[PDB]
Coordinates of C-alpha atoms in Angstrom, one line a residue:
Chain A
X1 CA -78.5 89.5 55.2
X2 CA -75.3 89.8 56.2
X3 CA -72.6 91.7 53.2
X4 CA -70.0 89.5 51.9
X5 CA -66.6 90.5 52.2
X6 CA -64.9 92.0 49.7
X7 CA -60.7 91.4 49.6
X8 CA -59.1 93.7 47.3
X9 CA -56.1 92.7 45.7
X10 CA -52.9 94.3 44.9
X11 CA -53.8 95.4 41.5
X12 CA -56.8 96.3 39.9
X13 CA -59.0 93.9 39.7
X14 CA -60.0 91.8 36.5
X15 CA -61.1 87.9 38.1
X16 CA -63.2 87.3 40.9
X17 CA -63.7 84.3 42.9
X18 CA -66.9 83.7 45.2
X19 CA -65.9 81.6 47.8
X20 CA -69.0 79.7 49.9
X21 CA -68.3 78.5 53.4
X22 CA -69.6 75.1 54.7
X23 CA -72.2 74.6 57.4
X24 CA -72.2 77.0 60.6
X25 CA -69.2 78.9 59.6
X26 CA -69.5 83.0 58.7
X27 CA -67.8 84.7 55.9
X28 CA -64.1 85.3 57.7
X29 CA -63.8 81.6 57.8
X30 CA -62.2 81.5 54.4
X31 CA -60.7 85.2 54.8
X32 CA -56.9 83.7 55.5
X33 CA -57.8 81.3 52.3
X34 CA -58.4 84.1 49.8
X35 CA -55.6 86.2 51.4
X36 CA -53.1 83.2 51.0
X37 CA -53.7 83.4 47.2
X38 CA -54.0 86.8 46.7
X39 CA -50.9 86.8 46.8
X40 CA -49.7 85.1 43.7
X41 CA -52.9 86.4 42.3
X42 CA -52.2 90.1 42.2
X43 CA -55.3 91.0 40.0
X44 CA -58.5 88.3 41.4
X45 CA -61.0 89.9 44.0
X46 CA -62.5 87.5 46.5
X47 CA -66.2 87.7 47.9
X48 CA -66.8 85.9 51.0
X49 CA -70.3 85.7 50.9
X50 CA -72.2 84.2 54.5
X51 CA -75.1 81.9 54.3
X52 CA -78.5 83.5 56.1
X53 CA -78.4 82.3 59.7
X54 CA -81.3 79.5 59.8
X55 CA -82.8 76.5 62.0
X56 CA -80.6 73.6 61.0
X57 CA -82.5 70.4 62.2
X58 CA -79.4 67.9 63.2
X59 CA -78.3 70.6 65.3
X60 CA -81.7 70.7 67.2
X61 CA -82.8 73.6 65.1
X62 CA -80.0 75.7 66.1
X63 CA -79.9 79.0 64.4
X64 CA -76.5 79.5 62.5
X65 CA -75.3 80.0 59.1
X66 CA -76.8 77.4 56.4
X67 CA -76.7 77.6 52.9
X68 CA -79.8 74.7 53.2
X69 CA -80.9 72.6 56.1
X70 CA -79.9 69.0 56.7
X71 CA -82.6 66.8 58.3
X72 CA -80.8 63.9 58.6
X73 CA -77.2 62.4 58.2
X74 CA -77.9 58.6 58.1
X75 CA -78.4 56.4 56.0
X76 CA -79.5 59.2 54.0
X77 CA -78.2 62.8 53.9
X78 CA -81.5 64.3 54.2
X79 CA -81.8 68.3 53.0
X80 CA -83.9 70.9 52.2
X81 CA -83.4 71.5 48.6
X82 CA -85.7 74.8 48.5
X83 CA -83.5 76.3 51.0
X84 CA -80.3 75.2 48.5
X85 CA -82.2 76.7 45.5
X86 CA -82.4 79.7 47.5
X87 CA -78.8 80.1 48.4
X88 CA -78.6 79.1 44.5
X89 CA -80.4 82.5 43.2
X90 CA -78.3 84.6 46.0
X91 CA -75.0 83.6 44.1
X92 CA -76.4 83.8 40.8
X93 CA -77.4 87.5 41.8
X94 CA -73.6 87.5 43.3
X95 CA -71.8 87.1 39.7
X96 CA -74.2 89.5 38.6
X97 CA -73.5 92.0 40.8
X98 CA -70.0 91.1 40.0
X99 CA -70.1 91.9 36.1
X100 CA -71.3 95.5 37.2
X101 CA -68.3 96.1 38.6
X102 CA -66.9 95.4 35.6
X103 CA -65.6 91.7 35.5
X104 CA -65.4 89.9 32.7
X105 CA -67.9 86.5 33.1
X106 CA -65.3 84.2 31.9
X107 CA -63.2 85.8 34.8
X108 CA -65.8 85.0 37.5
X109 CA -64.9 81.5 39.4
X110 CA -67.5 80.1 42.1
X111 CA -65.9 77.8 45.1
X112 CA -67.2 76.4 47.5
X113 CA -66.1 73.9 50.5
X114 CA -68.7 70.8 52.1
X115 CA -72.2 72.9 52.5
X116 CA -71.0 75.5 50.0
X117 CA -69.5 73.5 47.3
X118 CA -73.1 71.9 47.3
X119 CA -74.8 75.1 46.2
X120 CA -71.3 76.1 43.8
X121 CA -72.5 72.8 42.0
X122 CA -76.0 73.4 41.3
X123 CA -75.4 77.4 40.5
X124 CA -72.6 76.3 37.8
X125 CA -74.1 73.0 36.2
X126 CA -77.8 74.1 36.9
X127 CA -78.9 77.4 36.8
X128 CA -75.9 79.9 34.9
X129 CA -76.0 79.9 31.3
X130 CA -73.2 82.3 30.7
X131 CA -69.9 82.2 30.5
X132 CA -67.9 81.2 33.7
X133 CA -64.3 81.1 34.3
X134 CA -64.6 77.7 36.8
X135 CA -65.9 75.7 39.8
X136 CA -63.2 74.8 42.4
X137 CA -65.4 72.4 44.5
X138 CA -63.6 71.3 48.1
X139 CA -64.6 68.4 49.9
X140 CA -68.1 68.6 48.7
X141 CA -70.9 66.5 46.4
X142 CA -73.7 67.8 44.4
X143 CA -76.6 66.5 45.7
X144 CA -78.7 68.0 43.0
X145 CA -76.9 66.0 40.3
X146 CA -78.9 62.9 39.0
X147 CA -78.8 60.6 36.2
X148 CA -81.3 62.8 34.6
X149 CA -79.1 66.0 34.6
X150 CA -78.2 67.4 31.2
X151 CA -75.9 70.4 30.7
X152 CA -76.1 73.5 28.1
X153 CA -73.5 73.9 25.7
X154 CA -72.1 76.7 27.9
X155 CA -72.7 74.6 31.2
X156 CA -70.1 72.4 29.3
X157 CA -67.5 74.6 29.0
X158 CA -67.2 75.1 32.4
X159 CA -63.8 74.1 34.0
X160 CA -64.0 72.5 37.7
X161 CA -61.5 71.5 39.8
X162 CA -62.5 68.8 42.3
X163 CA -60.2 68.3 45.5
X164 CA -61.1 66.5 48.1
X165 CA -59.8 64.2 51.5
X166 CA -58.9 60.7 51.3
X167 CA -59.9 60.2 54.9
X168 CA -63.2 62.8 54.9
X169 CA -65.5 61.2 57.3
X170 CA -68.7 63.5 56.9
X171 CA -68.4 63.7 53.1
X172 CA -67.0 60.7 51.8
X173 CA -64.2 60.6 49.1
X174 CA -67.0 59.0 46.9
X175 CA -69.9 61.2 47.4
X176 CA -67.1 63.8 45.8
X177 CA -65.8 61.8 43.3
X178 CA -69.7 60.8 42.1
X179 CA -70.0 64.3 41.5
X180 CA -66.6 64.7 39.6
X181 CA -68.0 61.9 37.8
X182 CA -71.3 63.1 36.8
X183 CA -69.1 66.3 35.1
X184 CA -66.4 64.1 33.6
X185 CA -69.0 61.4 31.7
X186 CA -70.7 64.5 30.2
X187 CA -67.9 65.8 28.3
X188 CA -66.8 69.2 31.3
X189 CA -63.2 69.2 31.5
X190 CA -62.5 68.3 35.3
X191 CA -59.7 67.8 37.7
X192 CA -59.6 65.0 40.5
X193 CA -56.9 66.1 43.6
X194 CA -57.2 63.8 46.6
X195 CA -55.1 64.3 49.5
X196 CA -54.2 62.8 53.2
X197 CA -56.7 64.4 55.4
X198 CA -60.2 64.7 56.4
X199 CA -62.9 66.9 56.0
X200 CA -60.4 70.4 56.4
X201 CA -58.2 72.0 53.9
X202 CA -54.5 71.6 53.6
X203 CA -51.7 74.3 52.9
X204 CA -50.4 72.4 49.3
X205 CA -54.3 71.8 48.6
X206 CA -54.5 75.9 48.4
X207 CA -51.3 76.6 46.2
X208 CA -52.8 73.8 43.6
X209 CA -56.0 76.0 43.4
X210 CA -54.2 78.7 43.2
X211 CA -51.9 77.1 40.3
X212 CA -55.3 75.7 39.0
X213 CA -56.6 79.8 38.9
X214 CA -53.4 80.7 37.3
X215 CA -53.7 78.6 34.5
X216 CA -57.2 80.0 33.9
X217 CA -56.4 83.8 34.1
X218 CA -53.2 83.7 31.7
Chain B
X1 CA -83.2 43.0 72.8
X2 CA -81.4 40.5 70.6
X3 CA -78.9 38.5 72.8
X4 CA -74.7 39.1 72.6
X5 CA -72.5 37.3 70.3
X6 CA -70.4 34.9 72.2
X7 CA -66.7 33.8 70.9
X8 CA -65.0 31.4 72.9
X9 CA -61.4 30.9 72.9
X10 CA -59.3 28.1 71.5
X11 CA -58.4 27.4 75.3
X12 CA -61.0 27.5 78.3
X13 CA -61.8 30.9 79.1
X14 CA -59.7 32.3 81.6
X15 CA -60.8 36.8 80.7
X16 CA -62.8 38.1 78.7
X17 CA -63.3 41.2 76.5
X18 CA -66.9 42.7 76.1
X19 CA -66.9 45.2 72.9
X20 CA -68.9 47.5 71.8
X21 CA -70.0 48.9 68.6
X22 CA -70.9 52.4 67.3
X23 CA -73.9 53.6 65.9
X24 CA -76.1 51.7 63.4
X25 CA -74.1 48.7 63.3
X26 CA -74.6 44.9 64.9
X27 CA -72.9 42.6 67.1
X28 CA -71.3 41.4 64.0
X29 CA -69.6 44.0 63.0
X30 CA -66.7 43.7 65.7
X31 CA -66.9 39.9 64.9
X32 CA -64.0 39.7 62.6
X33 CA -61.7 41.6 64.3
X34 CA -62.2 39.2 67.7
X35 CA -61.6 36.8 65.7
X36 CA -58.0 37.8 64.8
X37 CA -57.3 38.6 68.6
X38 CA -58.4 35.3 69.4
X39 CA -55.7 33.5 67.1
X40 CA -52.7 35.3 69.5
X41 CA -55.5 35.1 73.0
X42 CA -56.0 31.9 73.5
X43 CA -58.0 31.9 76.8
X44 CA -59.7 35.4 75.7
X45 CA -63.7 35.1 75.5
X46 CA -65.2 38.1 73.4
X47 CA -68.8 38.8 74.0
X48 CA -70.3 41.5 71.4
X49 CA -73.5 43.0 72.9
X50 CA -75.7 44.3 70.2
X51 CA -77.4 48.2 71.0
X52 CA -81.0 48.7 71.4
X53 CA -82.7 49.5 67.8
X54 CA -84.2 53.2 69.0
X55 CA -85.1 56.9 66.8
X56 CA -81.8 58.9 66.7
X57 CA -82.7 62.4 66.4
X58 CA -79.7 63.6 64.3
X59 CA -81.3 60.8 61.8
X60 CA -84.3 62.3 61.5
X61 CA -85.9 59.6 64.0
X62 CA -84.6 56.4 61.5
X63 CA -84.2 53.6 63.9
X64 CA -81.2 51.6 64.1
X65 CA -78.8 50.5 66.7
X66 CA -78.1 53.0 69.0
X67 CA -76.1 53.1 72.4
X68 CA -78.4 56.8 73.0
X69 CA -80.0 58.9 71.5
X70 CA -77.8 62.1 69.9
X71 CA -80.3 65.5 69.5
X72 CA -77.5 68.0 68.3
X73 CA -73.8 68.0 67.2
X74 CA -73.5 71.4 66.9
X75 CA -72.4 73.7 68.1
X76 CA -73.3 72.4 71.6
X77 CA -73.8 68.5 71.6
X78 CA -76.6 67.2 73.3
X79 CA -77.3 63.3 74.1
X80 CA -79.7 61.2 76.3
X81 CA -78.0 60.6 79.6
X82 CA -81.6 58.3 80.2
X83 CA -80.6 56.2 77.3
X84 CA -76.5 55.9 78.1
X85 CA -77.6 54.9 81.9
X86 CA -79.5 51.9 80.6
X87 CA -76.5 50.8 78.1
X88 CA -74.3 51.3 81.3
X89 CA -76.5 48.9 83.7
X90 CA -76.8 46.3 80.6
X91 CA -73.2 46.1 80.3
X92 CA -72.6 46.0 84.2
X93 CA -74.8 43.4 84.2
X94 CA -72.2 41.5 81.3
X95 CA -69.6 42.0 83.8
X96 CA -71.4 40.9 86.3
X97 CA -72.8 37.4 84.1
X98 CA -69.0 36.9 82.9
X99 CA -67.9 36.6 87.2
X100 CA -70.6 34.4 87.5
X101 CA -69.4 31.5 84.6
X102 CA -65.7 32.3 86.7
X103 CA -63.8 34.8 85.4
X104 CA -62.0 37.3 87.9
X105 CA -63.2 40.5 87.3
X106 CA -59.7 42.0 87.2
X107 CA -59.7 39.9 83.5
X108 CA -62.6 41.0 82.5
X109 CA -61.9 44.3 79.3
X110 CA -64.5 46.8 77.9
X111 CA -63.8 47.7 74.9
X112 CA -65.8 50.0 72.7
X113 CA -65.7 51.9 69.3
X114 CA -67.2 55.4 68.4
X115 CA -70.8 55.5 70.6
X116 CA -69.5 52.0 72.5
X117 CA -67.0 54.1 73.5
X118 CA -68.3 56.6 75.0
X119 CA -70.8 53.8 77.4
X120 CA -67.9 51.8 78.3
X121 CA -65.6 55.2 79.3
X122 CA -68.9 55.6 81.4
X123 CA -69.5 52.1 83.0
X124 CA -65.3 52.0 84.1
X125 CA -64.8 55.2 85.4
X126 CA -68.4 56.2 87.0
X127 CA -70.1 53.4 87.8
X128 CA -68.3 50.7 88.3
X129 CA -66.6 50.5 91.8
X130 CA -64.5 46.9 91.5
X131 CA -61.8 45.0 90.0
X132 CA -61.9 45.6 86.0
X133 CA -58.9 44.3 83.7
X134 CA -59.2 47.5 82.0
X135 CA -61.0 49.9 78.8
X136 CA -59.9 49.8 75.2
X137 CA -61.0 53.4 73.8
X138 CA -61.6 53.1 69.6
X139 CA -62.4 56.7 67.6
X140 CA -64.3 57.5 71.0
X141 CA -64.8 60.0 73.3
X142 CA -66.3 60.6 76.9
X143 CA -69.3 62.9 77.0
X144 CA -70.0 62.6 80.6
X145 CA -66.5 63.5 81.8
X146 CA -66.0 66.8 82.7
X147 CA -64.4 69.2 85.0
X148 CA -65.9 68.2 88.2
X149 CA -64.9 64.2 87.3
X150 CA -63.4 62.2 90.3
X151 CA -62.5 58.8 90.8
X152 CA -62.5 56.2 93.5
X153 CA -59.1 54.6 94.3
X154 CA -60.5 51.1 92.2
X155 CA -61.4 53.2 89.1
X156 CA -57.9 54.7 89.3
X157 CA -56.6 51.6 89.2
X158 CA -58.3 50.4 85.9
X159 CA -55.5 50.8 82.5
X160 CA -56.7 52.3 79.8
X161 CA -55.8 52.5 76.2
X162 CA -57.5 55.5 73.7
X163 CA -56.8 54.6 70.4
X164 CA -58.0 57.7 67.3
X165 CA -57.5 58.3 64.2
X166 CA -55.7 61.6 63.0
X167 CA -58.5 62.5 60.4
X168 CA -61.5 61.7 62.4
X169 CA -64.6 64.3 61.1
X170 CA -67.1 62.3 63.2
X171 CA -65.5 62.9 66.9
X172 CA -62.7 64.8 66.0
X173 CA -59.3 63.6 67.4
X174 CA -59.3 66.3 70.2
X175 CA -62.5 65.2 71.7
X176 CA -60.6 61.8 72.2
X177 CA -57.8 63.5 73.1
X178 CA -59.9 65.0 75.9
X179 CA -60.5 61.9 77.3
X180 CA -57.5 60.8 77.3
X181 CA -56.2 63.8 79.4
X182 CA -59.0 63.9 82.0
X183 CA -58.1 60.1 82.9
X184 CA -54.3 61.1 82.9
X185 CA -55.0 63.8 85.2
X186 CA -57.0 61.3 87.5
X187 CA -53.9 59.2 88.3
X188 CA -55.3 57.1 85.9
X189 CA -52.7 54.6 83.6
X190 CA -53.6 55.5 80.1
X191 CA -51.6 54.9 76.6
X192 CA -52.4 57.1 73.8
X193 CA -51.9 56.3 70.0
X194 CA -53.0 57.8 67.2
X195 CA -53.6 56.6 63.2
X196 CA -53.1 58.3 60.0
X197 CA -57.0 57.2 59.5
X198 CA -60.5 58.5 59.8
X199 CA -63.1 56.8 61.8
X200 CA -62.2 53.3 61.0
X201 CA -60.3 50.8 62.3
X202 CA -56.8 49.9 60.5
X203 CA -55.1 46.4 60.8
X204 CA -52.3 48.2 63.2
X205 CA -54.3 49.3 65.3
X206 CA -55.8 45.9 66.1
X207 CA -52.4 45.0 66.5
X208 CA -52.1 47.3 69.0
X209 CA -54.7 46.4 70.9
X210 CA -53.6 42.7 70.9
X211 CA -50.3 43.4 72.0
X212 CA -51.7 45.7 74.8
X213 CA -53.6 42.5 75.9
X214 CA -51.3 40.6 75.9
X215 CA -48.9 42.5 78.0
X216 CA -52.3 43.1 80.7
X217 CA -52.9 39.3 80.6
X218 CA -49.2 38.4 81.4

């Protein structure tokens, strides 16, 4: 296990995001993300946590970091859904170990972006029952969502922001948007942001998150 | 080994464009946009091979049509260069069938999109040692160019137009890029354009690639 980083902001802190990365990447890959917003956000700690380094089976069993394998990306996106459970617990023991330090649950946010946002989706929806300040999910899905999922009262009262590419080729504006979907028919209070791009994130994508995190914290 | 789709022209058949498609779909999938060309090419004979149905790897084995096989996209992509040889002599061997009805090879285009692409980069500018009207490059790339690529005088000779969209997550727009710049370097006349698109194909584009004919026919 490799440590998450931990960015301090410019004041104390009193709001935390955890911030997953997507397949392969480590946990600097959103470092100039969280430091973009930190500074508007003067009091909100991010943790960069970084996926265990695993076989991943469309990349010939490659060895990188993985929040869950994926077997196969046509016709159907094939994964290992013990291996997302997994990374599920690790982030559940993240906002945990986030309370100690003395954050307020309802100032705790989870995102995640394409691999990540998968396992942001399930830990939110699926296994917390606490408070929770929000999901911001970024070009992502849930594939752990179903027909049959039902949330909690408090899984309800979850805000998520859902932002996604117009032009994503690897997840597909839909696969997001089934997700948003899933939240919105079942009473969550949910954004929808689409913008011109693929499967990346955009410079005016990260000031409406970090407008969408203001909003929450004042 | 289903037989090519074969789309003759309002007018007797005077060239000839063979076109390829990507991975998982028919010879009917590039069947409606040779139709449109048709309408401006009126002596223009499209045939639309249709890839061997074979396990892809990085599909977990589901069989499908498939140019060659594709074990790992990242971080280091590996194909079949067995499997790309044989969709090389197969569509040779169209060039060779389309001479034989009486069309000079010098009017005779390859044309291919995503994994067609990257065969038909192949069959111009390493195999094939003779007249050739020229390559039409859709959302492709060319896995077997690389730094040691030289061409005969002939190959330089054959235009070439590389065709991507901006927002492409399956072969990103620098990989066709790449191509693109290995064939410019080579003496070779290329025309880039580029799409505010993913991996698709937008009404413009086919434009494009009728006007481009056009001009190469006249």
């Amino acid at each position: 296990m490799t440590e998450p980083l931990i960015l301090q902001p410019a004041k104390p802190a009193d709001a935390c995001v955890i911030w997953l990365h997507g397949l392969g990447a480590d946990r600097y890959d959103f470092m100039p993300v969280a430091e973009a917003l930190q500074e508007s956000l003067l009091t909100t700690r991010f943790v960069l946590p970084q996926a265990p380094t695993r076989p991943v089976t469309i990349n010939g069993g490659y060895e990188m970091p993985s929040w869950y394998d994926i077997k196969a990306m046509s016709p159907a996106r094939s994964i290992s859904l013990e291996e997302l459970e997994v990374s599920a617990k690790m982030v559940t023991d993240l906002i945990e170990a986030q309370k100690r330090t003395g954050i307020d649950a309802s100032r705790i946010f989870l995102a995640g972006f394409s691999q990540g946002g998968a396992v942001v989706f399930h830990t939110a929806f699926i296994n917390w029952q606490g408070p929770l300040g929000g999901v911001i999910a970024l070009s992502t899905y849930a594939p752990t969502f179903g027909d049959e999922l039902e949330l909690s009262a408090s899984q309800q009262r979850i805000p998520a922001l859902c932002l996604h590419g117009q032009y994503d080729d690897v997840v597909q504006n839909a696969m997001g948007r089934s997700a948003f979907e899933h939240l919105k028919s079942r009473g969550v209070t949910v954004t929808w942001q689409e913008y011109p791009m693929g499967h990346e994130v955009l410079p005016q994508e990260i000031h409406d998150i970090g407008a969408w995190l203001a909003a929450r914290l004042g």
